[PDB]
Amino acid sequence: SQMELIKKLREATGAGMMDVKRALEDAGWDEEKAVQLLRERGAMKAAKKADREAREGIIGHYIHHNQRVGVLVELNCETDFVARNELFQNLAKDLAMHIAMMNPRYVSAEEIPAEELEKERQIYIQAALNEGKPQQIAEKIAEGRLKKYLEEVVLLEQPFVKDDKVKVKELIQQAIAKIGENIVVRRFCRFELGA
Amino acid sequence: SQMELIKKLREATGAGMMDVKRALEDAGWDEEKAVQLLRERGAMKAAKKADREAREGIIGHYIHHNQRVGVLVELNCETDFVARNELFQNLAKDLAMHIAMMNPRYVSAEEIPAEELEKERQIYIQAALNEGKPQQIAEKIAEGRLKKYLEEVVLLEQPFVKDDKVKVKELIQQAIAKIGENIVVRRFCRFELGA
Amino acid sequence: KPHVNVGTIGHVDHGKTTLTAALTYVTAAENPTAHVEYETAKRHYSHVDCPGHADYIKNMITGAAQMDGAILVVSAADGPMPQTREHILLARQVGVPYIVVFMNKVDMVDDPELLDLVEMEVRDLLNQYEFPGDEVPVIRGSALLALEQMHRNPKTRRGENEWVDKIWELLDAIDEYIPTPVRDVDKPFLMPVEDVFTITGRGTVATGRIERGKVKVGDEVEIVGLAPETRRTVVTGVEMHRKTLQEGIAGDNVGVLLRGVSREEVERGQVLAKPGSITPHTKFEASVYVLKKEEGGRHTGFFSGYRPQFYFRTTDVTGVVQLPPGVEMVMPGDNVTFTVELIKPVALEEGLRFAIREGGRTVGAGVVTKILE
Amino acid sequence: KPHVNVGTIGHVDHGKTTLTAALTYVTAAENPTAHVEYETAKRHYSHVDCPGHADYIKNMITGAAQMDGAILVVSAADGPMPQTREHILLARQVGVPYIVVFMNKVDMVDDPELLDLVEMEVRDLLNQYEFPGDEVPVIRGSALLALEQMHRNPKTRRGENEWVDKIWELLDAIDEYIPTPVRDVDKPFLMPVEDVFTITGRGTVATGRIERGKVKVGDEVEIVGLAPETRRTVVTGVEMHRKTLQEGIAGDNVGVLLRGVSREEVERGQVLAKPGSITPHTKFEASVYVLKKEEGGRHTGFFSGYRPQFYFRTTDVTGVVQLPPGVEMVMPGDNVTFTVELIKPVALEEGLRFAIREGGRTVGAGVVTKILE
16 A cells, blocks of 8 residues: 555565655556665666775685585675675675585675786687678677676676576675675685585 | 503504503503503504505594684595594594684695795795804794794694694594594685785 | 395405405305305395495385395404594495394404403494494404414315414304395285286176285285275185286286275385285385486486475385485485375385386386385 | 763664764854864763773773763664674673764655654664663664754854754753763762872871862771781871862872871871771682783783782782683783782772782783672
8 A cells, every 4th residue: 555565565575665656656656666766776876886995894715515515705885884784694604505506706796807818709600600691690609608607707797506597796786786795705714525 | 450451541542452561561560651652653654555545534624613714625535434534523622723813834744845935945945144144053044934834834743733742743643643544725715804 | 045145344554355355265165336255155145335324225225235134353462443433334224134143353363351342332432323232242252263264275174274264263253143034925925917808797807916925716806006995805816917827926016806805906116915914105205316418317406395206016105205304405425314295095104116207218226114104 | 060971882884973973063153082072061071982882891990981971873764783783782891871863854755654664663773681671761763864953054053943953852962861960079988099108206107199078087998909908097187289288189199197197007009098998808700901912011911820910090909810700811902801819808898990910010900899798
């Protein structure tokens, strides 16, 4: 109804009381086109604090039940108040767990140097120029063949282990939205026994 | 009692029953020389398996109470049976904790470029002659100086955090003795928040 | 002559490897997964080996391994090793029937009051894990010397050499302290239902391969699984390859008709067996092994709530996983233990092996360890 | 005119920073850390800032901070933030006397029902942590606009501007709701002994600065600390700078002689105060902060069993640390809570600050949080 729809709603998305109402109006009073609005809108708030400083936070970890794989992860926020919040906590636990399974190589894309990306990017067009279509066609062929690569090696671009429907970055952005503090993944560590 | 002697000496050092008798025999039926003999002797055993391959073990970890420091450590043994043993478990927990505090740079000495230290030594002999010290005098200091250095950056040479009286390596050797499987520290990982 | 599987567990530097060798050469002179074989007068044996705990579980699940009993090898000179606890622990887990002990390297210890001690240690350790630590036999000897002698005289025999006689002491111990495993046909009847059909005039009939037991006509039987209640009736006829059979036994592909059973009161997936032998359930505990991605298993891991297909013999049933405390996520290759709840009741029993799949694609495999409901 | 300490907690993007500035400029037109100051008609104020849970908690121990009350800044447009739970949590921990609320950015919200709601949320949230969520005053306004107005007219006053009147509503709420600190000289007497000697014919005399309370002559007192028993006598004279005093009050560097007290019966470290007021103990709980190596603190960490020095006013007694479950080792820079046991009894009370050292060098500093034995 009124604050009852908004309530039950924000209650779930943990967002801005006014931003909630705004979205219900903004997209008729139906939850589905609202929560999805909120999600979509949240993505923006994220990019706004994207360059804010964050040296607070904690060290997340995940130790597989069989002790054969362990992961360390530095998750920074702005204030230690946030760091202590159940949401930060869980996000961290969940990120560590994800890494354990997905085994990313980098945190973000920019983390990748040129000479490196290139020594690779060409091995891409090398085999494309063969199986038919020459360079021009194979240059745009190796345009989406990279997107896949990043979804594999880059933590942020990886499909979240508890919902292959959303990319890691998104999971993060979502958090940032409900908190209001820039959240960054400083670095991670992963050991797999005999590997 | 003669019995009670070994029976309780073995119970402490957890070593080869017969080896216990031997030591007590070999060193007059009094502990000090005995236990010290067992200790002295366990090191040798240890040295006997140093090259034995060991791809089993677990990933040890330590997360400070305040979550500002976390450590990962790969501890290998030969059989997974051992890996599961309470002692391996503890050794690993303890090693993790130690690293958290001592912050070593390397696991072992060989892990370091021999000429880098070789350079750093003459770098030590330099400042000694530089301060009014004769060559032969300044040569000595370099050892105690380098030795000190290794005791700082190298995990094995570090004085164990729960008993500054024994070096980490020793703690390890001691375990190997009671178990009978080469035990190695493959690698470690340490994150200190904003550091 | 009976056949049995035995295995050796213990520290390698204690000679379990050597002892194994010693047993083959020693019996050789009387009887005219990497395994070796040897046979006494009474039974025939094959040797298993337990190098890994985790590894043994996997094979135990993939039906490979199957120890009817096991030998524990400890050096009398060192006495138990801390891992010995872990060795034993495994046995309890897989549930080895009985255990026999061999105190090796006994020639390397002067005082005999010491041996008695070592043995008392061990005996207690097993007691700690339900094993009859006092009832269990403990042989004292030297695998090495025993072997050296066999090498010298491959034809050596009982009574001749001192150390060999100890090995025999052991072979004998085995023969006695390990009852022989009930044969399949000797176990209570059971047959998983594959197909069904009515044969006008006779009644409703059900096909399948007998898993165990035998069964002639007039034999009383039960229909367990899927249904809200276990129905019970009597066999009115047996037939193999459509040609009357007096009796059908384990491993036979047969067909059976029952009394007072409508064509709709029975169907594939169900199972019929000696009344009271097994019951239907939906919640249980189990030890599993998830196939690695390379073996075709999942690509990622999973958490509590996972809802796959569980195959029990001929069936395929849906259920939800409940990862226990301490277990937060499961990845390909893992060995785990979790509880499971299915949509329909099924004839379940401890030990019952099964498989898991995501659209015909086998992703895991386990065995039931405990019935809950 | 009374002085009070107040701090601001809450999300920064909610304007707690802006609100602080508005409070200064707004009272300026009526009354002629890196803290700021401002005063109403009734009292004088100094503003604390809480950017870190730890950061602050640290200072609350090193005597620095001391919030007599605090203001919670939440944007009415967003409503509470998840961390809001953590903000309040801190307050509970340090135990802030009372809290006042200011719903900022109220101009950016059309519907006034939401406001009632937002407030509903907060109110309950505090209730969850023992705070009178209902009794607490909740002011609605806009720090920004209130400030912009003060910028345009630095002399603006009560009743003139709409947004400034709301800031006043707040200033007022503070004055009221907020209990005013309980002065010192009003608190039971107490003085830490520094030196003790005699003045032939006069008796045994002990110097020191009074900490709290007052004291004349003939007053009955107690000597707590160090000794096996708490001796008690009566004051036989007071004197400041060696020149008789009518009465000695908190903050007075004085000296006092006692009746029936040998020179050996009193010494530095000991303390004298209102009888029955405080008692001697050896086991207690406390919140601490270990100095980082740079701050000259330890070089390494330590574990349960650590046996250092705890400077309690004038003394420096020995005791042993007992790290609690969950805490295994402590390193320089850490904030902790552990129990302690000392060799000799001491006058202890919750709130009592102290310091730790390893041979004169201060390595840590904390405050007592609970008395045990």
